[PDB]
Amino acid sequence: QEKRKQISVRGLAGVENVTELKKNFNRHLHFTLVKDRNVATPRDYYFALAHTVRDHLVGRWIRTQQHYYEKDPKRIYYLSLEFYMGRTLQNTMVNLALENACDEATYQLGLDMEELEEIEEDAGLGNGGLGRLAACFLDSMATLGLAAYGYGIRYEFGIFNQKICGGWQMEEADDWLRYGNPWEKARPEFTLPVHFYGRVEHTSQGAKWVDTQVVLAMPYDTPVPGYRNNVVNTMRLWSAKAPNDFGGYIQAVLDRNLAENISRVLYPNDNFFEGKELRLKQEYFVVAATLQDIIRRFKSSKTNFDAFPDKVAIQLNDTHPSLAIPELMRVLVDLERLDWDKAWEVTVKTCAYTNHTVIPEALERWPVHLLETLLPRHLQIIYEINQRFLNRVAAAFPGDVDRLRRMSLVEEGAVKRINMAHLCIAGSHAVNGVARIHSEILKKTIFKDFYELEPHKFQNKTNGITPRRWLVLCNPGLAEIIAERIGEEYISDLDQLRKLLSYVDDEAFIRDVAKVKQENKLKFAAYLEREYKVHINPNSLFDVQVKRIHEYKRQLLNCLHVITLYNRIKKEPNKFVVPRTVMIGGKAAPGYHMAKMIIKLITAIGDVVNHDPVVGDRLRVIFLENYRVSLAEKVIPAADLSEQISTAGTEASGTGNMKFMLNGALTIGTMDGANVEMAEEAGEENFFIFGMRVEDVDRLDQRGYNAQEYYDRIPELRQIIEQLSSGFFSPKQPDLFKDIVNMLMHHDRFKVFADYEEYVKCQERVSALYKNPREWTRMVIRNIATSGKFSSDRTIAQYAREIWGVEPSRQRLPA
Amino acid sequence: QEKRKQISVRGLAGVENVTELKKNFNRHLHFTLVKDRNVATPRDYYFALAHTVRDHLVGRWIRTQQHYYEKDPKRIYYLSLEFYMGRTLQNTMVNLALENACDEATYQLGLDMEELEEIEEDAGLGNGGLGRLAACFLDSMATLGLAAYGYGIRYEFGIFNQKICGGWQMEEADDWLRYGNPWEKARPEFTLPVHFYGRVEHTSQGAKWVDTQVVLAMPYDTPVPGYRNNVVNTMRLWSAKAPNDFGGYIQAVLDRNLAENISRVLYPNDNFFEGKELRLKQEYFVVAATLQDIIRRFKSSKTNFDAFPDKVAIQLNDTHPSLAIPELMRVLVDLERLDWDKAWEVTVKTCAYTNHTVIPEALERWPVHLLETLLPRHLQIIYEINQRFLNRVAAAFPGDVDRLRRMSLVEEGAVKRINMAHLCIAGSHAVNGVARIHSEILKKTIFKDFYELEPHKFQNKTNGITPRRWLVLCNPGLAEIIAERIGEEYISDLDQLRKLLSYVDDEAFIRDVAKVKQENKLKFAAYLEREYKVHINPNSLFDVQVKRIHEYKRQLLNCLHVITLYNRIKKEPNKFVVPRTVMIGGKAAPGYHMAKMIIKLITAIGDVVNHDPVVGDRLRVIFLENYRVSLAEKVIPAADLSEQISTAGTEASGTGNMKFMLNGALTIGTMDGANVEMAEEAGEENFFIFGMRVEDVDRLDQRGYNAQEYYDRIPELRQIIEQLSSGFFSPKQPDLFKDIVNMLMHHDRFKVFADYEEYVKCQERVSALYKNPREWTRMVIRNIATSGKFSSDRTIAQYAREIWGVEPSRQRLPA
Ligand SMILES: O=C(O[C@@H]1Cc2c(O)cc(O)cc2O[C@@H]1c1cc(O)c(O)c(O)c1)c1cc(O)c(O)c(O)c1
Ligand SMILES: O=C(O[C@@H]1Cc2c(O)cc(O)cc2O[C@@H]1c1cc(O)c(O)c(O)c1)c1cc(O)c(O)c(O)c1
Ligand SMILES: Cn1c(=O)c2c(ncn2C)n(C)c1=O
Ligand SMILES: Cn1c(=O)c2c(ncn2C)n(C)c1=O
């Protein structure tokens, strides 16, 4: 398409730039891929272009890191077990102003760059929100000119590739490195030792960790480009490698796999803790290798570690890298020979912890036996930390033994465990939630005792998304029509979107806003046909719930509504209803049974709804296979209605909600997480807010949630439960959904029936406004225009000023 | 050193060529390695140069393979489980005439290219002779313009890196790909399925192999340059990969390792069969993937497979890829649907087998149960092959049931097994030994019954070595002085070395020949000091035995001589003897106990000899650690005396013997293998030939080898055995060498004591001639000058005309 090359926000196709791009495209095709045009596949062409484009990163990559050496600013180390990065090619081109040039260059070579882009595998090294937040954060940190380093693990296999088979999820390994990763640079020369198991000997000069098994940590460095500032930061991902030295010789060589299994696969759990030793090993591996790099870089700068927190910030993405606190102490005390108290002064000032959930099954609580075996010296240090910390509690609250037991890092029981959130709080100067309501809920509940001891520690940092990936990349049509009115500065100053409120009554913007949405919808519809032979009605309302499958996110509530629409159609076939394509998508953790049942229910509903000739194209329900960052970039720009329907108090923030707001969808949701702040930014009048508020959930809990009451009082709801029990959605297996029915009736922690009625009526209001295109689009304008707060640039600037103590900059580097 | 850049056989340093080399060196340093000069290590500089040099291969690589597509010549597939390739960088530069240019280019950048070369890891994907023959063969095949493809396995770990610790061998994994391989091109797009286990169902149209576990075979292609002919052939090495589809999900991902273990490590056995299922899997993996490529290329050329043997030659390097015979039949019968007899016509005409040993512990005899489980359809086919083959025996020799049982592919016993040599003979049109004596010994003994049935099958192909690696690369000084007299054509026409017999009385050549040897010796001496802090006397005779540690190669015989020299010195301290550095080197297979004892004995002798102040620098015995192709290239040019002392009839050919002859060493050896032909080429008067001849070994076997006789009749020998028994060479452990003593006295298959006396006296003749420099050097000239026959170019030309049916060419391709 030539129209796309006329998108100004995609930059200049300079005649010489084009000429050079083609020359280097053809150079990589010959020397790097060893192909000629006669045997070259699209995949080769994608790689030629990827190599060509990565070459443009290299100069800035070297100069940026030298700049940091020269200026010696405080360094931000963002430790996370996940980096949900997605694809890199388009992102590279946008941040380097090369998109239109590459598009013209490939066009002259007879190629469609859009097709080439689709050959790239996602770097799916995350589960969901926490992982994708880390990716967004790296991008914003680069755009804000921070000396910032992402540190994590190079999983051989990312989040599993989901296939739906028989209506059921099947998992297949995500072999994302099969054809190579052209972005990363392997750094074997900078390999570091990590120790495991062993024993502690307390000798003359103190403790010594000995008799340890070594696993080498090999770093791969990936470039992280800011938005047109000539800044390229580094994401460093550690890969596990058997040590150089040592059933026989053959077996010994084979057994090198055991150690190398630590970096093999992402644990595919979203918001759920599994106490597997391999997972614990992964956490120590990232923390140990990462902290050796930080100490070395600290020493090779302009030992006295009193200035370590002036030059080092370690940000903990959840408790997953929590061992960085005992590990930093270990290095400082056992190897650098610092007194414990100075070491602890340094540690607390250097470390800060970000919490992502109040849900108990997600919080890390490691058995002491496991910590004792695998990391004996760390357990010792944790116990010491706990004694001095509880001593402070005692002195602050004399005689409150109850607070002592509650605040202990050590949790008593049949199995003694270490509470890793407690360790983080004790060992960090800053603790933040990711949305106002969540940060409030932490100081009033889960962490209230810690808030009372150290109020000053507790902060809020409302999550954000990068408007590069999540607008310019994914929705170029919308970015353009915005740029035509207000220019391009908003791309790294998203609060400038408020200027668009001046256009609520401009007929061309109203027309253009709707036209872009139509275009995104036609393109997504076409996508399902070619890739999955699925027919969807492009003049239907696109109702999308995409996110990991969960009880607390209430995909089930969405199911109940969908079946309601179906049954209402059957009772009154002749009555007009706004046509709808209900799209639900997301992965279930492989061991989460309810989530796999929920996926099966969505498809089972589809099997009835989509083949009923009375319904026809009035209602269609499809399960979007293999939801991942690449598919988010397709389906979200195409969405009319954003489903954000978690039980009030359960979704700490959400980030999918913000992506939908940024891309021209209206939101139907509870007052939970950032939904609260999104409605405050836009006005509640521009959101479909429904359901119980947190305080209402509490009152139910106070008197007990009896699901039976709602079933006995709501005829439409009872009908649906009867259809599920008796086997209307599973004729060949009538009892198939009994577990779903049983949880809803007797063990529903998330109170789906209690929001059922308000939800259904709120959906009626949605349909009503959809019948009025002009006013739909006008309310959409009011949303897009107030979405600026939810830029990750704002989030990061806040981290920088309020926790890290660094001042962000958007000034370009010379290049 | 500037002198080396004045070596004409290293080509022109063209001013523009130099300029471009530096530009691309600096380009790879920046864009490929992402370094600058301030942080660049030697290793980076080596990689920049490797990348730069590999770029010069690419154009010829593509054009050569297109040339083969266009002309459609018969294709040679050299199947081997080993490719002992060594380093590639210097070899690339010599075959492309880039050596002096790169040397000047790196010099102007302030770099020593010789230092850079030493950072390259060997591709040590072989054990010894059979492996290095395959490497030599690929090089000659390229130089002779044959459409030839090396096919094997990309082992993750090659032959183990040997460390001597306490006088003992220790094995460490050969992590040859730790910092990457810049020569190979990964080809994931050409991945192929290989099947294992399963069952056979005989249906309508015939048999079907079903219920199989799949292992993907991923090819990596390495360039193979001929000598200045613009030809670049391909070595394709298969790497094992878990299939795309499927204790839980985590465990399933981890368990992908099991399948990927097939390409993990070379079995480090030299001339020894180990019936491990993993080894069998390796053999099938290479044969199955390789034959799918051959069939596909056959079909994509200008199905009737009557012309398959006109377009395809499969050469089997030992019985290791023997399954190619049942596998080709399987494809032809079960998938292409050809009648068995036409399929068998095709198979025999396509396959040929090369035998490398007459020793029984080396020959492959696989248990039928193992073949039945792992490859059920192959076993079926083997049985059928055996029936029709034995039917031919029966018809040729009616009533000889004894011949039937002896010639059977099936060997009866407690465990029934398949004899893989027998399968090869039955399924191949050509069977060759690798030296005249060995090829004769096969038709008179091991394979006499097969020779009687099919005389026409049995050939000789005396082994060879490439004069590129083994003269021009490793000994540039010698190549030059040769080139000054006769020019450069000899480098690919080695028989031209006979012209050097005209110089036996030329004083400058005599001077120059000796001067080069002195230079190689001083350089090797310096090597031991820097890398191992070992002092050797450069005015001593360099007595070198390098090769895998073996009973049959008789390193022990060398030990006996060394101790004799030591004891003779002690009895008569004042008596002059020619100073000697005895150098023994080689790896023992990890499970071969005697070989590990032999290594310990060599070092133990050193511990006495090298610290006796009466001996001083008159005698020194050192064990050369980690003998591999790179070290062969150093030590052999430095050698005065080549130890080739296998028991007559045991070493099929040898190739180390030819490397020493080519590089200016005189040979002390038995009449075994190619030693017989080397002495015929030079004249026995120019070789130190000693010991029993094969017929003498036979007579001993006829009456029984009683070691006691030699001990009771030879005082000097009895003394040494007493020193070994009583613990003179092991004071802290007197009984340490009892196993050696016991084998020599009672279970010596290789009759060391029977050649002891003739060996010792032959060594006296060696020392005597060494006292006369002029006549030493003159005899060396007579050796170098007659070494031409032992070029692998001659060997390969013979394979091509006498087995493959293709005419070699040394004409350059346009480029
Ligand atoms: O199905 C079409 O695209 C798919 C859907 C889609 C989207 O919704 C948003 C987005 O950011 C990208 C995107 O890439 C999809 C796509 C998939 C392919 O396999 C492919 O080859 C391609 O060019 C693209 C399509 C159809 C069209 O008819 C068309 O003209 C076009 O440009 C594209
Ligand atoms: O020890 C020296 O080389 C080593 C021995 C050696 C050899 O015997 C033959 C050969 O083909 C190459 C060869 O490379 C060796 C070597 C090892 C190194 O670690 C190294 O840095 C190097 O430049 C080289 C040496 C000493 C010298 O004094 C010298 O001038 C020199 O050029 C080289
Ligand atoms: C019970 N359960 C699981 O068993 C689970 C999970 N996420 C992953 N798994 C395995 N969640 C959220 C959960 O509630
Ligand atoms: C007995 N034996 C072994 O046990 C052996 C070997 N090569 C390897 N091994 C393990 N050889 C040659 C051998 O004779």
DSSP secondary structure string, B67-82? HHHHH---EEEEE-S-
A276 is catalytic: no
Resolution (A): 2.5
- Cα A317-A323-A329 angle, rounded to 5 deg: 120
Upper half-sphere CA count for residue B22 (Cβ side, 13 Å): 16
Check CB contact of B36 with chain A, cutoff 8 Å.
Answer: yes
- Greatest CA span in chain A, whole angstroms? 89
> Which residues, other chains included, contact B277 with Cβ-Cβ below 8 Å and sequence gap of 6+?
B370, B374
For chain B, what is the radius of gyration of the CA atoms?
Answer: 27
| Cα distance between residue A755 and residue A710, in whole Å | 10
For the record, the structure tokens of B110 come out as: 């302030």
Give φ, ψ of B669 to 5 degrees.
-165, 165
| Cα distance between residue B799 and residue B786, in whole Å | 22
Check CB contact of B209 with chain A, cutoff 8 Å.
Answer: no
Q: How far is the CA of A206 from the centre of ligand 2 (A)?
A: 46
Q: Strand pairing partners for A163?
A: A170
The crossing angle, in degrees rounded to 10, of helices A15-27 and A42-71 is 110
Asked if B322 and B420 count as a contact pair (C-beta separation under 8 A), the reply is yes
| Cα distance between residue A241 and residue A192, in whole Å | 10
Residue of the CA atom closest to atom 3 of ligand 3 = A592
Q: What is the dihedral of CA A775, A780, A786, A789, to 10 degrees?
A: 160
Asked if B324 and B291 count as a contact pair (C-beta separation under 8 A), the reply is yes
Asked if A157 and B253 count as a contact pair (C-beta separation under 8 A), the reply is yes
Asked if B160 and B171 count as a contact pair (C-beta separation under 8 A), the reply is yes
Cβ neighbours of A391 (radius 10 Å): 11
| Cα distance between residue A30 and residue A42, in whole Å | 15
What is the Cα B20 distance to its own chain's centre?
A: 37
SS3 content of chain A, % helix, strand, coil (to 5): 55, 15, 30
- Measure in Å the smallest separation between the Cα of B614 and chain A Cα atoms: 39
Q: How far is the CA of A549 from the centre of ligand 3 (A)?
A: 10
| Cα distance between residue A5 and residue A515, in whole Å | 18
Give φ, ψ of A207 to 5 degrees.
-90, 155
For the record, the structure tokens of B426 come out as: 């039955």
Query: Scanning every residue of chain A, which has its alpha carbon at the shortest distance from the alpha carbon of B266?
Result: A250
Structural element, H or E, at residue B201: strand B199-202
For the record, the structure tokens of B769 come out as: 């001639």
Q: Which amino acid is at A79?
A: L
Cβ neighbours of A681 (radius 10 Å): 20
By the 10 Å C-beta count (0-12 exposed, 13-18 middle, 19+ buried), A802 is classed as middle
A517 is catalytic: no
| Cα distance between residue B636 and residue A572, in whole Å | 96
Phi-psi region of B12 (alpha: psi -120 to 50; beta: other; left: phi over 0): beta
* CATH superfamily to which B538-773 belongs: Glycogen Phosphorylase B; (3.40.50.2000)
Contact list, B189 vs chain A (CB under 8 Å): 41, 43, 179
Q: Out of B172, B178, B179, whose CB is closest to A246?
A: B172
Give φ, ψ of A80 to 5 degrees.
-150, 145
| Cα distance between residue B609 and residue B603, in whole Å | 10
| Cα distance between residue B660 and residue B130, in whole Å | 18
Query: Scanning every residue of chain A, which has its alpha carbon at the shortest distance from the alpha carbon of B170?
Result: A246
The crossing angle, in degrees rounded to 10, of helices B42-71 and B99-108 is 150
| Cα distance between residue B5 and residue B392, in whole Å | 64
Asked if A431 and A355 count as a contact pair (C-beta separation under 8 A), the reply is yes
Indicate the length of chain B as a whole number.
Answer: 815
Rounded alpha-carbon distances, angstroms, from residue A551 to A128, A129, A708, A719, A738? 15, 16, 19, 21, 16
| Cα distance between residue A400 and residue A452, in whole Å | 13
| Cα distance between residue A719 and residue A739, in whole Å | 17
| Cα distance between residue A772 and residue A610, in whole Å | 26
The crossing angle, in degrees rounded to 10, of helices A593-609 and A738-746 is 110
Check CB contact of A296 with chain B, cutoff 8 Å.
Answer: no
| Cα distance between residue A445 and residue A319, in whole Å | 18
Strands A417-419 vs A410-411: parallel, antiparallel or unpaired: antiparallel
For the record, the structure tokens of A236 come out as: 């460093």
Which of B238, B447, B419, B386 minimizes the C-alpha distance to B319? Answer: B419
Measured on CA atoms in the order A626, A629, A635, A636, is the torsion positive or negative?
positive
Q: Does domain B72-87+122-464+798-804 have CATH number 3.40.50.2000?
A: yes
B547 is catalytic: yes
Cβ neighbours of B644 (radius 10 Å): 28
| Cα distance between residue A123 and residue B660, in whole Å | 54
Strands A410-411 vs B199-202: parallel, antiparallel or unpaired: unpaired
Q: Is B214 helix (H, G, I), strand (E, B) or coil?
A: strand
For the record, the structure tokens of A101 come out as: 């040039």
For the record, the structure tokens of B16 come out as: 């523009």
Asked if B314 and B351 count as a contact pair (C-beta separation under 8 A), the reply is yes
Q: Which amino acid is at A236?
A: R
Asked if A599 and A623 count as a contact pair (C-beta separation under 8 A), the reply is yes
- Whether residue B189 and residue A41 make contact (CB cut-off 8 A), yes or no, is yes
Asked if A751 and A692 count as a contact pair (C-beta separation under 8 A), the reply is yes
Discontinuities in chain B with C to N beyond 2.5 Å fall right after 246, 302
Measured on CA atoms in the order B74, B75, B80, B81, is the torsion positive or negative?
negative
For the record, the structure tokens of A778 come out as: 């006008």
Structural element, H or E, at residue B22: helix B15-27
> Which residues, other chains included, contact B36 with Cβ-Cβ below 8 Å and sequence gap of 6+?
A62, B29, B30
Structural element, H or E, at residue B236: strand B232-241
Q: Which residue matches tokens 């191949």?
A: B428
| Cα distance between residue B691 and residue B667, in whole Å | 14
Asked if A794 and A467 count as a contact pair (C-beta separation under 8 A), the reply is no
- Sheet of strand A365-367: strand arrangement: A365-367, A417-419, A410-411
Cβ A612 under 6 angstroms from ligand 1: no
Asked if B694 and B650 count as a contact pair (C-beta separation under 8 A), the reply is no
For the record, the structure tokens of A602 come out as: 């969505």
- Greatest CA span in chain B, whole angstroms? 89
Q: Strand pairing partners for A78?
A: A150, A315
Which of B556, B555, B568 minimizes the C-alpha distance to B612? Answer: B568
Contact list, A249 vs chain B (CB under 8 Å): 160, 171, 268, 590-591
Rounded alpha-carbon distances, angstroms, from residue B513 to A555, A671, B636, B664, B785? 86, 93, 15, 8, 12
Give φ, ψ of B710 to 5 degrees.
-65, -40
For the record, the structure tokens of B126 come out as: 């072989």
Annotate B270-287 with DSSP letters as a single string.
SS-----HHHHHHHHHHH
> Which residues, other chains included, contact A212 with Cβ-Cβ below 8 Å and sequence gap of 6+?
A195, A196, A197, A198
For chain A, what is the radius of gyration of the CA atoms?
Answer: 27
- Whether residue A242 and residue B180 make contact (CB cut-off 8 A), yes or no, is no
Q: What is the dihedral of CA A505, A511, A516, A521, to 10 degrees?
A: 110
Q: Is A69 helix (H, G, I), strand (E, B) or coil?
A: helix
By the 10 Å C-beta count (0-12 exposed, 13-18 middle, 19+ buried), A593 is classed as exposed
Q: How far is the CA of A1 from the centre of ligand 1 (A)?
A: 11
Task: State the closest ligand 3 atom to the C-alpha of A591, by its place in the atom list counted from 1.
Answer: 10
- Measure in Å the smallest separation between the Cα of B44 and chain A Cα atoms: 10
Among 3.30.530.20, 3.40.50.2000, 1.10.10.10, 3.30.1160.10, name the CATH number for the domain at A72-87+126-190+230-464+798-804: 3.40.50.2000
For the record, the structure tokens of B628 come out as: 């591999």
Asked if A81 and A127 count as a contact pair (C-beta separation under 8 A), the reply is no
Mutate to test the interface with A, among B34, B56, B177 (most CBs of A within 10 A): B34
By the 10 Å C-beta count (0-12 exposed, 13-18 middle, 19+ buried), A704 is classed as exposed
Asked if B468 and B497 count as a contact pair (C-beta separation under 8 A), the reply is no
Asked if A550 and A599 count as a contact pair (C-beta separation under 8 A), the reply is no
Structural element, H or E, at residue B1: none
Q: What is the dihedral of CA B594, B599, B602, B605, to 10 degrees?
A: -80
Q: Which ranges in B226-359 belong to alpha helices (H)?
A: 249-254, 256-260, 277-299, 308-311, 324-330, 340-350
Which of B801, B791, B609 minimizes the C-alpha distance to B133? Answer: B791
Q: DSSP secondary-structure letter at A37?
A: T
Q: Which ranges in A120-222 belong to alpha helices (H)?
A: 129-143
| Cα distance between residue A757 and residue A680, in whole Å | 24
Q: Which of residues 109-148 of B touch A (CB under 8 A)?
A: none
> Which residues, other chains included, contact B602 with Cβ-Cβ below 8 Å and sequence gap of 6+?
B555, B559, B584, B621, B623
Give φ, ψ of B687 to 5 degrees.
-130, 145
| Cα distance between residue B269 and residue A279, in whole Å | 38
Number of the ligand closest to the Cα of A596: 3
Q: Is A99 helix (H, G, I), strand (E, B) or coil?
A: helix
Q: Out of B62, B261, B264, whose CB is closest to A34?
A: B62
Q: DSSP secondary-structure letter at B588?
A: P
Q: Is A81 helix (H, G, I), strand (E, B) or coil?
A: coil
| Cα distance between residue A197 and residue A269, in whole Å | 26
Cβ neighbours of A710 (radius 10 Å): 21
Q: Are both B72-87+122-464+798-804 and B538-773 of the same fold?
A: yes
Asked if A113 and A102 count as a contact pair (C-beta separation under 8 A), the reply is yes
Asked if B668 and B763 count as a contact pair (C-beta separation under 8 A), the reply is yes
Asked if B759 and B714 count as a contact pair (C-beta separation under 8 A), the reply is no
> Which residues, other chains included, contact B772 with Cβ-Cβ below 8 Å and sequence gap of 6+?
none
Domain boundaries, chain B: 72-87+122-464+798-804, 538-773
Structural element, H or E, at residue B688: strand B688-689
For the record, the structure tokens of B403 come out as: 């011949």
Discontinuities in chain A with C to N beyond 2.5 Å fall right after 246, 302
Q: Is B163 helix (H, G, I), strand (E, B) or coil?
A: strand
Rounded alpha-carbon distances, angstroms, from residue A424 to A432, A434, B553? 11, 16, 66
Q: Is A667 helix (H, G, I), strand (E, B) or coil?
A: strand
Q: Which amino acid is at A427?
A: G
Which of A641, A734, A754, A648 minimizes the C-alpha distance to A694? Answer: A648
Q: Which amino acid is at B257?
A: N
Cβ neighbours of B20 (radius 10 Å): 16
Annotate B739-778 with DSSP letters as a single string.
HHHHHHHH--TT-TGGGHHHHHHHHHHHHHHHT-HHHHHH
Q: Is B182 helix (H, G, I), strand (E, B) or coil?
A: coil
For the record, the structure tokens of A442 come out as: 């932490």
Asked if A674 and A790 count as a contact pair (C-beta separation under 8 A), the reply is yes
A553 is catalytic: yes
Q: Which ranges in B168-226 belong to alpha helices (H)?
A: none
Asked if B160 and A249 count as a contact pair (C-beta separation under 8 A), the reply is yes
Domain at A483-689+756-787: CATH code: 3.40.50.2000
Which of A674, A129, A145, A78 minimizes the C-alpha distance to A352? Answer: A78
| Cα distance between residue A683 and residue A783, in whole Å | 9
